[PDB]
Symmetry: C3
Subunit: 172 residues, 3 copies
């Protein structure tokens, strides 16, 4: 094992590699969502921007996990990335529903890794997650929930109108 490794279980090391794969899969999903909203037959620029910014945040989360794996003396191991679950993402409402389902799965994976760290008595790992991940996911999920309420109140009987207005007046 590493010259530096101390109090770092093989179970946590493997779970960190699987979480890197989830975050990179989530980034890839957001890349697909963003380019879908840039299609000329979809054409919602603020929705495109919202998802492209999330693609960058999820890749940054993966790279912070990989930095920490090396700082603890674990060994990064990469696996195939599965393509996103859809090729076309429907309305902004459909896309925001898929986004909050994706973020709740990331949050559950973070909470499961925290529970493993707590069982392994690994307080650096618990610190790391509580400082860089758990509050970021709660805030993002709250933000998506607010958006989903506003998109839903705009459907009325003029769904196209509501979709334009949300993009223009909430997402710029």
């Amino acid at each position: 094992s590493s010259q530096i490794r101390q109090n770092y279980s093989t179970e946590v090391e493997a779970a960190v590699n699987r979480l890197v794969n989830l975050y990179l899969r989530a980034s890839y999903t957001y890349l697909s969502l963003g380019f879908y909203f840039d299609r000329d037959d979809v054409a919602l620029e603020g929705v495109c921007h919202f998802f492209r910014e999330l693609a960058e945040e999820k890749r940054e989360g993966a790279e912070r996990l990989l930095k920490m794996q090396n700082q603890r003396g674990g060994r990064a191991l990469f696996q195939d990335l599965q393509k996103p679950s859809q090729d076309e993402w429907g309305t902004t409402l459909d896309a925001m529903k898929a986004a909050i389902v994706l973020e709740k799965s990331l949050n559950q994976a973070l909470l499961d890794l925290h529970a493993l760290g707590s069982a392994q008595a690994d307080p650096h790992l618990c610190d790391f997650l509580e400082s860089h991940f758990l509050d970021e996911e709660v805030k993002l999920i709250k933000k998506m929930g607010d958006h989903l309420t506003n998109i839903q109140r705009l459907v009325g009987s003029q769904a196209g109108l509501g979709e334009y207005l949300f993009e223009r007046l909430t997402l710029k």
Copy 2:
């Protein structure tokens, strides 16, 4: 339950609402302490200012708890606020003793909520308390203990003299 709620127990949700009530009660107590020291027959401006600033800090603590309740998908519920325990607060020594008793009760309520979060495996809640509340209460209680030692060493056999000097030279 919320579209956003995840890993957030009904027990924690209720305990957060009760802690909001404690913090708003503490704010109300500090408002009363501050206006008492502004009476013309008490007239200790630095003591007034010390307690009025604490009234604001305790209201800010309540509003940060309420923000977090909504970020987790819980439901704020407000109850009646009881009036403070006294209408007149005696000397600066009496008032500082009542203040440290009040802050030790807030600290115990924070530690009890942390213990509930730890039993519910709610690391976002534990993070939140450890980042925004626990060190603020330890520092404030230390600061009050320092003040109580200085007020006590000033009583001597010239209590009025000591009360003036403490207000002038420690609390500006």
Copy 3:
């Protein structure tokens, strides 16, 4: 006990005093390492500077522990400081190996104190260590491990050459 003390076990108080002694011993060891590399017959200025800066960081860690002991209402108690384990420290490789052994002992003492805090349900203590100590030790141990790999790849069959180059091009 203190007017301020709350949820602060005698076991944690004593363990904090022992950790202060370890940190001051580590500072003293780094003072010795730094002055050894300033000898005219050793003369590695970047190595001197590296260890003198660690002597200051370990003394600062002791003083932050002592500040927290007083903020919790415990009582600082100082013991004799043992001299460092060596009077002469060999090559930069020998010195960096002794440094990472010393930092791994500090890290284990921090993890043991965190485990005691967790058993005593002392979340302020756990917070304190996770915020000011645990990530600083992981980062430093990683940094020393990187240095040890670079020093080792420079030994070749020209050890003096490698020792000069490391000092000049990594440690300025």
